[PDB]
Protein backbone atom coordinates (compact mmCIF):
# COMPACT_ATOMS: atom_id res chain seq x y z
CA UNK A 1 0.00 0.00 0.00
CA UNK A 2 0.94 3.69 0.09
CA UNK A 3 2.76 3.38 3.43
CA UNK A 4 5.89 2.51 1.42
CA UNK A 5 5.55 5.55 -0.86
CA UNK A 6 5.85 7.90 2.14
CA UNK A 7 9.10 6.61 3.65
CA UNK A 8 10.69 6.95 0.20
CA UNK A 9 9.64 10.61 -0.20
CA UNK A 10 11.73 13.49 1.12
CA UNK A 11 10.18 16.94 1.24
CA UNK A 12 6.78 18.45 1.94
CA UNK A 13 4.11 15.80 2.58
CA UNK A 14 0.48 15.55 3.68
CA UNK A 15 -1.21 12.49 5.14
CA UNK A 16 -5.01 12.79 5.16
CA UNK A 17 -5.66 9.93 7.58
CA UNK A 18 -8.86 9.31 9.52
CA UNK A 19 -9.44 7.85 12.95
CA UNK A 20 -8.01 4.38 13.49
CA UNK A 21 -5.55 4.75 10.61
CA UNK A 22 -2.41 4.48 12.76
CA UNK A 23 -0.99 7.99 12.56
CA UNK A 24 1.49 7.35 15.38
CA UNK A 25 2.99 4.29 13.68
CA UNK A 26 3.64 6.06 10.37
CA UNK A 27 4.90 9.19 12.13
CA UNK A 28 7.42 7.20 14.17
CA UNK A 29 8.48 5.18 11.13
CA UNK A 30 9.07 8.34 9.09
CA UNK A 31 10.97 9.99 11.96
CA UNK A 32 13.24 6.96 12.37
CA UNK A 33 13.82 6.68 8.61
CA UNK A 34 14.74 10.37 8.35
CA UNK A 35 17.11 10.17 11.32
CA UNK A 36 18.80 7.00 10.02
CA UNK A 37 19.19 8.37 6.49
CA UNK A 38 20.71 11.73 7.44
CA UNK A 39 24.35 11.93 8.59
CA UNK A 40 24.55 15.71 9.15
CA UNK A 41 24.33 17.82 12.31
CA UNK A 42 20.68 18.77 11.74
CA UNK A 43 17.77 17.61 13.89
CA UNK A 44 13.97 17.25 13.77
CA UNK A 45 11.09 18.75 15.74
CA UNK A 46 7.87 16.88 16.53
CA UNK A 47 4.99 19.10 17.69
CA UNK A 48 1.76 17.71 19.13
CA UNK A 49 -1.23 19.02 21.11
CA UNK A 50 -1.01 16.88 24.26
CA UNK A 51 1.76 15.75 26.58
CA UNK A 52 0.52 12.16 26.29
CA UNK A 53 1.33 11.88 22.58
CA UNK A 54 4.64 13.66 23.16
CA UNK A 55 5.64 11.15 25.84
CA UNK A 56 4.48 8.22 23.70
CA UNK A 57 6.66 9.35 20.80
CA UNK A 58 9.58 10.08 23.15
CA UNK A 59 9.39 6.55 24.55
CA UNK A 60 9.01 4.92 21.15
CA UNK A 61 11.97 6.74 19.57
CA UNK A 62 14.48 6.00 22.34
CA UNK A 63 17.63 7.80 23.48
CA UNK A 64 20.19 9.77 21.49
CA UNK A 65 22.70 12.58 21.91
CA UNK A 66 21.30 14.26 18.79
CA UNK A 67 19.11 17.15 19.86
CA UNK A 68 15.55 16.53 18.68
CA UNK A 69 12.53 18.38 20.05
CA UNK A 70 9.52 16.23 20.97
CA UNK A 71 6.67 17.98 22.75
CA UNK A 72 3.70 20.29 22.40
CA UNK A 73 3.55 23.16 19.93
CA UNK A 74 3.12 25.58 22.85
CA UNK A 75 6.43 24.44 24.30
CA UNK A 76 8.12 24.70 20.91
CA UNK A 77 7.89 28.49 20.74
CA UNK A 78 8.75 29.01 24.41
CA UNK A 79 11.81 26.76 24.23
CA UNK A 80 13.17 27.83 20.83
CA UNK A 81 12.03 31.34 19.81
CA UNK A 82 10.68 33.42 22.70
CA UNK A 83 12.76 32.64 25.77
CA UNK A 84 16.19 32.80 24.02
CA UNK A 85 15.57 35.74 21.68
CA UNK A 86 12.99 37.98 23.39
CA UNK A 87 15.59 40.54 24.50
CA UNK A 88 17.36 40.54 21.12
CA UNK A 89 14.18 41.66 19.33
CA UNK A 90 12.61 44.26 21.64
CA UNK A 91 15.17 45.16 24.30
CA UNK A 92 17.04 44.18 27.42
CA UNK A 93 14.13 45.27 29.65
CA UNK A 94 11.81 42.54 28.36
CA UNK A 95 12.28 39.50 30.64
CA UNK A 96 12.98 35.91 29.68
CA UNK A 97 11.62 34.65 33.03
CA UNK A 98 8.11 33.23 33.28
CA UNK A 99 6.15 30.30 34.70
CA UNK A 100 3.38 30.01 32.11
CA UNK A 101 -5.60 33.77 35.84
CA UNK A 102 -3.95 36.86 34.32
CA UNK A 103 -5.56 36.74 30.87
CA UNK A 104 -6.56 39.95 29.10
CA UNK A 105 -8.06 41.03 25.76
CA UNK A 106 -5.20 42.96 24.13
CA UNK A 107 -1.71 42.24 22.81
CA UNK A 108 -0.16 45.37 24.34
CA UNK A 109 -1.48 44.41 27.77
CA UNK A 110 0.04 40.98 27.18
CA UNK A 111 3.43 42.61 26.66
CA UNK A 112 2.79 44.74 29.75
CA UNK A 113 2.05 41.63 31.82
CA UNK A 114 5.14 39.84 30.51
CA UNK A 115 7.30 42.87 31.35
CA UNK A 116 5.97 44.39 34.58
CA UNK A 117 4.32 41.29 36.05
CA UNK A 118 7.01 38.91 34.72
CA UNK A 119 4.54 36.18 33.73
CA UNK A 120 3.48 34.97 30.30
CA UNK A 121 0.26 36.54 29.05
CA UNK A 122 -2.88 35.01 27.57
CA UNK A 123 -6.06 36.03 25.72
CA UNK A 124 -9.68 35.95 26.83
CA UNK A 125 -10.92 35.28 23.29
CA UNK A 126 -9.94 31.72 22.23
CA UNK A 127 -10.00 32.70 18.53
CA UNK A 128 -6.70 34.62 18.80
CA UNK A 129 -3.27 33.49 20.00
CA UNK A 130 -0.68 35.48 21.95
CA UNK A 131 2.19 32.96 21.92
CA UNK A 132 2.23 32.26 18.18
CA UNK A 133 1.96 35.93 17.19
CA UNK A 134 4.73 37.01 19.56
CA UNK A 135 6.88 34.19 18.18
CA UNK A 136 6.39 35.37 14.60
CA UNK A 137 7.04 38.97 15.67
CA UNK A 138 10.34 37.92 17.25
CA UNK A 139 11.35 35.86 14.21
CA UNK A 140 10.99 38.93 11.96
CA UNK A 141 13.00 41.22 14.27
CA UNK A 142 15.95 38.99 15.27
CA UNK A 143 18.50 37.81 12.70
CA UNK A 144 20.15 35.43 15.16
CA UNK A 145 16.77 33.80 15.86
CA UNK A 146 16.22 32.99 12.18
CA UNK A 147 19.85 31.89 11.87
CA UNK A 148 19.48 29.46 14.78
CA UNK A 149 16.18 28.08 13.48
CA UNK A 150 17.71 27.49 10.04
CA UNK A 151 20.95 26.00 11.39
CA UNK A 152 19.16 23.72 13.88
CA UNK A 153 16.35 21.75 12.21
CA UNK A 154 15.95 20.24 8.74
CA UNK A 155 12.38 18.92 9.14
CA UNK A 156 9.41 19.55 11.43
CA UNK A 157 6.66 16.99 12.03
CA UNK A 158 3.16 18.36 12.72
CA UNK A 159 0.11 16.26 13.61
CA UNK A 160 -3.57 17.10 14.06
CA UNK A 161 -3.33 20.15 11.81
CA UNK A 162 -7.12 20.53 11.67
CA UNK A 163 -7.14 21.95 15.22
CA UNK A 164 -4.86 24.88 14.36
CA UNK A 165 -5.54 28.59 14.72
CA UNK A 166 -4.60 31.19 12.13
CA UNK A 167 -1.47 32.19 14.07
CA UNK A 168 -0.15 28.62 14.08
CA UNK A 169 -0.71 28.46 10.32
CA UNK A 170 1.05 31.81 9.87
CA UNK A 171 4.12 30.75 11.85
CA UNK A 172 4.40 27.34 10.18
CA UNK A 173 4.02 28.84 6.71
CA UNK A 174 6.64 31.49 7.53
CA UNK A 175 9.03 28.69 8.49
CA UNK A 176 8.16 26.72 5.34
CA UNK A 177 8.49 29.63 2.88
CA UNK A 178 10.90 32.24 4.24
CA UNK A 179 13.29 29.84 6.01
CA UNK A 180 12.99 26.87 3.60
CA UNK A 181 12.29 24.14 6.16
CA UNK A 182 10.40 20.99 5.19
CA UNK A 183 7.06 20.10 6.79
CA UNK A 184 5.23 16.83 7.48
CA UNK A 185 1.53 17.38 8.16
CA UNK A 186 -0.90 14.72 9.41
CA UNK A 187 -4.55 15.42 10.18
CA UNK A 188 -8.14 14.16 10.06
CA UNK A 189 -10.50 16.64 8.34
CA UNK A 190 -13.54 15.41 10.32
CA UNK A 191 -12.04 15.69 13.84
CA UNK A 192 -12.61 19.41 14.47
CA UNK A 193 -14.68 18.79 17.62
CA UNK A 194 -12.11 21.00 19.40
CA UNK A 195 -13.59 24.09 17.70
CA UNK A 196 -14.41 25.38 21.19
CA UNK A 197 -10.69 26.22 21.51
CA UNK A 198 -10.54 28.41 18.39
CA UNK A 199 -9.68 25.65 15.93
CA UNK A 200 -9.97 26.61 12.25
CA UNK A 201 -10.56 23.57 10.00
CA UNK A 202 -10.35 25.80 6.91
CA UNK A 203 -6.54 25.79 6.97
CA UNK A 204 -6.04 22.05 6.51
CA UNK A 205 -8.71 21.83 3.82
CA UNK A 206 -7.24 24.81 1.99
CA UNK A 207 -3.79 23.22 2.10
CA UNK A 208 -5.24 19.97 0.75
CA UNK A 209 -7.23 21.61 -2.05
CA UNK A 210 -4.80 24.38 -3.10
CA UNK A 211 -1.20 23.46 -2.23
CA UNK A 212 1.08 22.82 -5.21
CA UNK A 213 4.39 22.05 -3.45
CA UNK A 214 2.81 19.51 -1.07
CA UNK A 215 2.71 15.76 -1.75
CA UNK A 216 -0.63 14.28 -0.70
CA UNK A 217 -1.39 10.75 0.50
CA UNK A 218 -4.40 9.13 2.16
CA UNK A 219 -4.42 6.15 4.53
CA UNK A 220 -7.39 3.78 4.70
CA UNK A 221 -5.79 1.27 7.09
Amino acid sequence: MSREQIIKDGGNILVTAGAGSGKTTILVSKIEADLKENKTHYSIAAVTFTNKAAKEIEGRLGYSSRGNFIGTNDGFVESEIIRPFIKDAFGNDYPDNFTADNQFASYDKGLQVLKYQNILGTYSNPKKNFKFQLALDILKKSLVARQYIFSKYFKIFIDEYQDSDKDMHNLFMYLKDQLKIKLFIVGDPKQSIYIWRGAEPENFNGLIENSTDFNKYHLTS
Partner: peptide, 24 residues
Protein backbone atom coordinates in the same frame (compact mmCIF):
# COMPACT_ATOMS: atom_id res chain seq x y z
CA UNK B 1 30.39 33.45 5.85
CA UNK B 2 27.33 31.92 7.52
CA UNK B 3 25.65 31.84 4.11
CA UNK B 4 28.44 29.91 2.35
CA UNK B 5 29.81 27.76 5.21
CA UNK B 6 28.36 24.77 7.05
CA UNK B 7 30.74 24.93 10.03
CA UNK B 8 29.25 28.29 11.01
CA UNK B 9 25.90 26.48 11.21
CA UNK B 10 27.47 23.70 13.28
CA UNK B 11 28.62 26.32 15.79
CA UNK B 12 25.40 28.35 15.68
CA UNK B 13 23.14 25.34 16.31
CA UNK B 14 24.66 24.70 19.76
CA UNK B 15 24.86 28.40 20.63
CA UNK B 16 21.41 29.95 21.04
CA UNK B 17 20.96 33.17 23.02
CA UNK B 18 24.63 33.92 23.70
CA UNK B 19 24.63 35.80 20.37
CA UNK B 20 23.25 39.25 19.63
CA UNK B 21 22.32 40.76 16.27
CA UNK B 22 24.68 43.74 16.56
CA UNK B 23 27.57 41.26 16.98
CA UNK B 24 26.43 38.56 14.56
Amino acid sequence: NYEKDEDTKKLISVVKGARTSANA
